[PDB]
Amino acid sequence: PLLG
Amino acid sequence: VLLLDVTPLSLGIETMGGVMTTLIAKNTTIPTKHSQVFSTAEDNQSAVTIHVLQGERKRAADNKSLGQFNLDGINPAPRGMPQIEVTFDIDADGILHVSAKDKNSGKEQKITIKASSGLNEDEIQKMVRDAEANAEADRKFEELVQTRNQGDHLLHSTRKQVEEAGDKLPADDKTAIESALTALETALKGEDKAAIEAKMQELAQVSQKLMEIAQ
């Protein structure tokens, strides 16, 4: 559920 | 009705590891609105890239790019704490509105994607064909990205806990844990699922005192  | 307007392919975004996370599933009837809350990959991250994807492949790179856009102005925080709500909204006219809202800083950024964007009737069948053709490979990639994000979580959480611990941790434990974290960081760069799990296992075998202290 993480974005860079 | 004799007719349904439906999505021929999954719509979603790229998440950490270059995976497609689906917000609107294949064969969804329009109009439709779905949202999911995402967070930051790194400590003190000031912005997210929203990369919008159409397709059925697990690898972000193997799907059709509908566009991307940034949401800046994220306030300094530990990774995983900011709440970035992503909304995909397809109206009656088949236009896709994508929004990212920071639930702290209230900031919003959108991209609008015309009903005509993305893959043509043929490319859709070629994409659906590839999904099922490369299904085994997409599973293997999926559990490598899972393994990688578990190792990255273990790396980051362990460094945090070594610090909170300070003098409480025997020198012997710290040397052993420090060596294992270096070895795990190195293996996380690579592609070898087995080598990541081996370094994760080393860190867990040597970390028992640190885990007691983190109590």
CB B101 within 8 A of CB B69: no
CA distances from B4 to B1, B25, B63, B92, B124 (A): 7, 15, 24, 11, 17
Measured CA to CA, the distance from residue B98 to residue B67 in angstroms comes to 10
Task: Please indicate whether, in this complex, the C-beta atoms of A3 and B84 are within 8 angstroms of each other.
Answer: yes
Domain segments of chain B as ranges: 6-138, 139-214
Q: What homologous superfamily is domain B6-138 in, according to CATH?
A: Substrate Binding Domain Of DNAk; Chain A, domain 1 (2.60.34.10)
Pair B16, A3: CB distance under 8 Å: yes
Q: Which residues contact B190 (CB under 8 A, 6 or more apart)?
A: B196
Q: In whole angstroms, what is the distance from residue B161 CA to residue B210 CA?
A: 7
**3-state class (DSSP) for residue B97:** strand
Whether B139-214 and B6-138 are alike in CATH topology: the answer is no
Collapsing DSSP to helix, strand or coil, B63 comes out as coil
Backbone Cα Rg of chain A: 4
Contact residues, chain A, for B48 at CB < 8 Å: 3-4
CA B195 to chain centroid: 22
Chain A neighbors of B49, CB-CB under 8 A: 3-4
Cα–Cα distance for residue pair B200/B154, rounded to 1 Å:
8
Q: What is the resolution of this structure in A?
A: 1.8
Give the Cα separation of B166 and B159 in Å (integer).
11
CATH architecture, domain defined by B139-214: Up-down Bundle (1.20)
